[PDB]
Every structure is written in C-alpha cells, then in structure tokens.
Amino acid sequence: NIVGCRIQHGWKEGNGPVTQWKGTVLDQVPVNPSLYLIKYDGFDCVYGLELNKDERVSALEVLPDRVLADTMIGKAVEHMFETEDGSKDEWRGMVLARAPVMNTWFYITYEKDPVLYMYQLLDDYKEGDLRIMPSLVGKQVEYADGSKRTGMVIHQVEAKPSVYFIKFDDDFHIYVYDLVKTSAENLYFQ
Numbered sequence: 001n002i003v004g005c006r007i008q009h010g011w012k013e014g015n016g017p018v019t020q021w022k023g024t025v026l027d028q029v030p031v032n033p034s035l036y037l038i039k040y041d042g043f044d045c046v047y048g049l050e051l052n053k054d055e056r057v058s059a060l061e062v063l064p065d066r067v068l069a070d071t072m073i074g075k076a077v078e079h080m081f082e083t084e085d086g087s088k089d090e091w092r093g094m095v096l097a098r099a100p101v102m103n104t105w106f107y108i109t110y111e112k113d114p115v116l117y118m119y120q121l122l123d124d125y126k127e128g129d130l131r132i133m134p135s136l137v138g139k140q141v142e143y144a145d146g147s148k149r150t151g152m153v154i155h156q157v158e159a160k161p162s163v164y165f166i167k168f169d170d171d172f173h174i175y176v177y178d179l180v181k182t183s184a185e186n187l188y189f190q
C-alpha cells in the first residue's frame with residue numbers, strides 16, 4: 001504493497017468517538033515492515049502506525065488512485081508561518097530529506113518540536129517564508145526520574161549521519177534526534 005496509496009480509516013481510542021482520517025502512505029519501514037509512515041491530509045507531522053495490528057484503526061480502505069531544490073537538504077532554516085491571530089511567527093529547524101512518494105515535499109524538524117514534519121518547502125521559499133541559513137538503524141532504544149520509554153531506530157539521515165528517526169512504542173509521532181546533542185543524552189541503544 002500500500003506504499004504510495006491514499007487511504008482512509010476510522011480511529012478510536014478507548015471508549016472515545018470514532019474519527020475519520022484520509023492520508024497518503026509514504027513508507028513501509030524496512031527494519032519493521034509492519035510500520036507505515038503516513039501523511040494525513042491537512043496535518044503537518046509524519047505519523048507511524050503498525051496498521052496490521054493497531055486495534056485503534058478500523059475500516060481501512062484504499063482510496064482511488066490520485067498521486068534542483070535538493071540544495072536545501074541538510075540546511076538550517078528559519079520557517080515562517082501565519083498565526084491564529086494574523087501575526088507572523090517562525091520556527092528554526094533543519095531540512096532532513098526529500099519526502100518519499102510525495103516527492104515535491106521535504107522532511108523537516110524543529111528545535112521547538114523535534115518530531116518529523118513534512119512541508120512543500122520550495123513553495124514556502126518562493127513565498128518568502130523560508131530563510132536558508134549560511135549501523136544504529138534497527139537497534140532498540142530506551143530512555144529513562146523513572147520515565148522508561150522504549151522504541152526502535154528506524155532511519156538515519158544521509159545528509160547528517162548523527163541524526164536518526166526513532167519510533168517509540170507509546171506514540172505515533174516520529175522522533176528526530178542528533179545523537180551528539182543534549183536532547184539525546186538519555187537515549188541508550190541495544
């Protein structure tokens with residue numbers, strides 16, 4: 001496969017209401033083929049779900065088929081955006097890679113929220129909203145006073161090889177870490 005397909009499904013946590021979601025399947029993770037990375041319409045993060053076993057997913061359907069600036073990859077950037085009150089704000093981050101499947105899009109993450117995001121950064125650049133600044137994959141990871149969180153390293157960023165993507169068992173975001181930085185100092189690997 002469903003990589004490259006558009007999908008829709010219901011979502012239900014506990015006894016809560018069922019919500020309906022539409023998205024695009026970007027990736028079947030090689031080190032965990034149960035794990036799919038998904039871009040949901042209108043939501044900017046990249047999500048990871050083990051679709052074959054996550055009981056929160058219901059009524060999974062495949063939707064009918066729909067669908068250089070590589071110099072930006074690896075760059076530190078300031079990404080400007082419009083706020084709920086009209087004022088402009090910005091987050092600084094790093095362009096990680098071109099997104100798969102949705103190839104005009106780019107993977108990016110930010111110091112203020114170091115999870116995996118996906119944006120049409122060449123459009124934002126043309127609009128004046130992007131300022132360009134001048135073997136662990138497959139291993140288990142844990143971080144832990146008393147917070148004991150488990151996951152897996154799922155990808156290494158080719159353009160900055162100390163940077164990795166991690167999928168934690170307790171959440172559907174994709175977490176991005178530079179293993180030389182303070183943000184990663186409580187991550188341990190096996």
Ligand SMILES: COc1c(CN)cc(CN)cc1OCCCN1Cc2ccccc2C1
Pocket residue numbers: 042044079080081082091110119124129
């Ligand atoms: C506002 O999001 C953007 C949108 C809207 N879909 C669109 C675009 C593309 N023009 C950029 C955005 O922001 C680029 C920085 C990263 N965002 C800043 C932020 C603030 C609060 C909550 C989450 C985020 C993520």
